[PDB]
Design a protein around this ligand. Structure first.
Ligand SMILES: CC(=O)c1cccc(-c2cnc3ccc(NCC4CC4)nn23)c1
Ligand SMILES: CC(=O)c1cccc(-c2cnc3ccc(NCC4CC4)nn23)c1
Lengths: 293, 293
C-alpha cells in the first residue's frame, strides 16, 4: 500500500510526489499519458538488471493504479528532500570540496551505468540518453544520484544484440549532442549512446562549476546555451547553435585563475567535440576527477 | 523471489509453469514476444481492478525478468493442478451434479466479470473476449475459474468512456461470434463484447454437456464445430460455417431423454442467435442454472 502525500513537481513528464510506502518516505513519479513507454523501459531496466548503486536513483517498485476510472503508471523510488541538482544550484553556491564531490558522484554513477559487469552483482552496459541537471538528485550527504531511465539502452558482450526498445520520445533538446541534432548518429552502434551521455555530462559539469566560488566570485546559475537560445528551444535552434555555428558554453575567464576550475574546464572541453569518437569515457572522467582537488 | 519448477504447457501463447513463490505452489505464465500487449492489459486489469472471486483465476503478481540477456513477461497466479477444463473433459465423464456445478461456476464467474459493482469491493464491468475451455481452470472442489484476461475490455457507468486498449491479437477463431466473423461488430458499444462472451459460453456449455452421462451414455469430447472445420481453422472457414451456412453445434438426440440436458440445450440455444441483441445475459444464465437440477 502507498499513499501520495505531497506533490513536489508538476510538468510535461507528469508528476513527482513525496509518498509513504508503509509510512516510509518515498518518491512516486506519476507518468503522463505521453510517456507510457518510458514507464515500461524504466520498469524493464530496474527489474531485469541490478542497479543498486549509491549514485543511481534507487528503485523500490513500479505499479499501476486507477484514479478517475483511468489507469496511472507509477514508478516508486527513493526520495531525496533537497531535490534536483537543477534546483540546488539556484539555491546555493559551492566550495571546491562540495563541487568535486557533486561532479565525482555523477561520474561514479554514470561510469557504473556505462560498463558491463559480470558475476552475482553483474549488469549489462547502459546508456541514459537524457542526462541533465533536472534528472540528477542531490542527497543529504551532498552526493548526487542519477534519476530517469525511461530512454535508456542496454548491451552485453554476452549476446551483442542492441536493445534500444521503441520509445517515440527523444532527449531534451538543450542537451542534445551534435550527432543527434544532425540526425547523423549511427543508431546501430551502442557507443554512440555512451558518447551522447558524455556530451551531456560536459554541459552538466559546466552548470555546476559556475556555482563554485573562487576569488570570492561565482557566476549565477544558467542552463547551457542560455545566452543563445530561448526557453524551450526548437530543434532547428539548437541545431544552428551547436551544429552550424558550432558554438559551446563559454569558460568564464575567472576560472583560469583557479586550477580546479581550469582542470574541470580542460575536462568538459574533452566532452564537447563534434566528432563523438574523440570525447572522453565516463571512466576516464571518473578517474580524472578522482585525482583533482 | 520465484522459481519455476515444472512446465505444464507450451504453446503459441507462451508457457505456463508450476512454480514456487517462497516455496508456495503457483502458476507462472511466461508470455511470448507476440503477446507483450496481452501481459500489459492483464496486468492493468488485475492491479487497477479488484477481481477477487472464487470463479476468477486468482492473481498474485506480474513481473519482468531476464533469461538470456532478454526480457520475459510473467504473470503469476493461483495454480490448479487438475488443469484446464479442456484437458479435464477428455480425461473424464460427468454426472448431473458435477456437470451443473462446473457450468454454474463458469456463469457465477462470468456474471461477476460482466457487471459493475460499487463501494469498497467494487469493479467496473469487464468483457473477456476469449472465453473457451482452455481458458478455464478446474479446481479440486470441481468448481471452475476463468483465466486469461489479456483481451479484456472495461466500462463504468461512472465515466462512460470505453477502454478497449490497443491489442493487435483477436479471439480464438473457433469461438468467434458471427458479428466478429462478419466484421460487423460495433466496436463502439460495450455490450457487443458481453454478448460475444455469451456466445462463447454457449459453445463451452455444449462442450461440457457432452460429457454428462444419461442412460449410461456420453458423447466423446469434441471442440465446437469439430465435424465441419479442421484444426486451426481459417478465418474464412469459421465465417462460412457460422455466417454463411449459418450452422451451430448439433444437439445429440439422447439429450432430449434427459430434462437437465434438455434444459442446458434450451439455454445454449439462447446463446447462439446471429443477432447479438437477442442472446441471454450472464446473469440470466447464472440464475437459470441456479434453478436447474
Ligand atoms: C528526476 C526524476 O525523474 C525522479 C524520478 C523519481 C523520483 C525522483 C525524486 C526523488 N526525490 C525527489 C525530490 C525532488 C524531485 N523533483 C522532481 C523534478 C526534478 C525532476 N524528484 N525526486 C525524481
Ligand atoms: C489459462 C491460462 O492462460 C492460465 C494463466 C495462468 C495460470 C494458469 C494455470 C494455473 N494452473 C494451471 C494448470 C494448468 C494450466 N494449463 C495451461 C494451458 C491450458 C492453458 N494452467 N494453469 C492458466
Amino acid at each position: 500500500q502507498i499513499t501520495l502525500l505531497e506533490c513536489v513537481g508538476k510538468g510535461r513528464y507528469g508528476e513527482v510526489w513525496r509518498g509513504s510506502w508503509q509510512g516510509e518516505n518515498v518518491a512516486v513519479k506519476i507518468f503522463s499519458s505521453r510517456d507510457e513507454k518510458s514507464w515500461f523501459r524504466e520498469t524493464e531496466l530496474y527489474n531485469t538488471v541490478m542497479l543498486r548503486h549509491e549514485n543511481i536513483l534507487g528503485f523500490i517498485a513500479s505499479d499501476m493504479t486507477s484514479r478517475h476510472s483511468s489507469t496511472q503508471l507509477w514508478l516508486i523510488t527513493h526520495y531525496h528532500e533537497m531535490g534536483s541538482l537543477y534546483d540546488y544550484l539556484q539555491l546555493t553556491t559551492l566550495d571546491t570540496v562540495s563541487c568535486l564531490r557533486i561532479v565525482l558522484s555523477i561520474a561514479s554513477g554514470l561510469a557504473h551505468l556505462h560498463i558491463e559487469i559480470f558475476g552475482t552483482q553483474g549488469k549489462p552496459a547502459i546508456a541514459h540518453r537524457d542526462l541533465k541537471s533536472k534528472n540528477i538528485l542531490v542527497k543529504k550527504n551532498g552526493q548526487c544520484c542519477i534519476a530517469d531511465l525511461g530512454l535508456a539502452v542496454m548491451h552485453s558482450q554476452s549476446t551483442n544484440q542492441l536493445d534500444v526498445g521503441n520509445n517515440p520520445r527523444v532527449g531534451t533538446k538543450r542537451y542534445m549532442a551534435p550527432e543527434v541534432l544532425d540526425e547523423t548518429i549511427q543508431v546501430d552502434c551502442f557507443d554512440s549512446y555512451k558518447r551522447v551521455d558524455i556530451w551531456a555530462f560536459g554541459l552538466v559539469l559546466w552548470e555546476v562549476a559556475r556555482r563554485m566560488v573562487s576569488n570570492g566570485i561565482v557566476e549565477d546559475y544558467k542552463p547551457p546555451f542560455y545566452d543563445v537560445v530561448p526557453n524551450d528551444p526548437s530543434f532547428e535552434d539548437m541545431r544552428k547553435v551547436v551544429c552550424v555555428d558550432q558554438q559551446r558554453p563559454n569558460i568564464p575567464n575567472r576560472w583560469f585563475s583557479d586550477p580546479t576550475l581550469t582542470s574541470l574546464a580542460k575536462l568538459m572541453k574533452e566532452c564537447w567535440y563534434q566528432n563523438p569518437s574523440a570525447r572522453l569515457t565516463a571512466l576516464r572522467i571518473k578517474k580524472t576527477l578522482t585525482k583533482i582537488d
